[PDB]
């Protein structure tokens, strides 16, 4: 009513492409507890690395790591089919606990983090500086990851749909499509956003008839 225990910085986890996904925002009143559900990046994925982050940067790395833990015994499934519920819990004492629960297996793994963990009152204010100071640089970073993943999806889902079709697809088309996948898979390895969209364009155009069959 006169004071207010708050979070000076955003708390969350590294997600695919080295982006920080925030779970609990900046200047949040403790106690607080938010959850959010995630999944796997490669098919037949058996574990996920929860890597805990503090700070206002979009790149995972430009932020302060607080810890890191795996949840395994993920029963084999298609990618992005598991339900990994990551929960952040801060009590009256300032202590952050972070679980991940496989909603199938029913397994669980928590890390507890002392209120004294992560950046001191000075670094907090630098973090906020370097955030405002690199708003755009990270704006460019975010939309590239989004493109990397938007790309990375399109690749996987096409390779599926090509197996799914088989005989049904003109060899004519399956050549034009198999080349445009190879090119897009290379584009993904670089950092050139344009190029990724360029090969996603090429795929889109030569894939007209593949789409039809899947539908």
């Amino acid at each position: 009513v006169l004071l207010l225990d708050v979070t000076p910085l955003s708390l969350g986890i590294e997600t695919m492409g080295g982006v920080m996904t925030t779970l609990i925002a900046k200047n949040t009143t403790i106690p607080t507890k938010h959850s959010q559900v995630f999944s796997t990046a490669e098919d037949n994925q058996s574990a996920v690395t929860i890597h805990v982050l503090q700070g206002e940067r979009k790149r995972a790395a430009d932020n302060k790591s607080l810890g890191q833990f795996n949840l395994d015994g993920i029963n084999p499934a298609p990618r992005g089919m598991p339900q990994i519920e990551v929960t952040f819990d801060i009590d009256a004492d300032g202590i952050l606990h972070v679980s991940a629960k496989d909603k199938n297996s029913g397994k669980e793994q928590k890390i507890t983090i002392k209120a004294s963990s992560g950046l001191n009152e000075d670094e907090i204010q630098k973090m906020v500086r370097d955030a405002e100071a690199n708003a755009e640089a990270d704006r460019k970073f975010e939309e590239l990851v989004q493109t990397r993943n938007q790309g990375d999806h399109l690749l996987h889902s096409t390779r599926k749909q090509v197996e799914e079709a088989g005989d049904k697809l003109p060899a004519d088309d399956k050549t034009a499509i198999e080349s445009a996948l190879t090119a897009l898979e290379t584009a993904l390895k670089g950092e050139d956003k344009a190029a990724i969209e360029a090969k996603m364009q090429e795929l889109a155009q030569v894939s007209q008839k593949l789409m039809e069959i899947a539908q």
């Binding site: 997600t15 995630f38 990046a41 929860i50």
Partner: peptide, 4 residues
């Protein structure tokens, strides 16, 4: 590796 985790995805949204």
């Amino acid at each position: 590796t985790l995805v949204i």
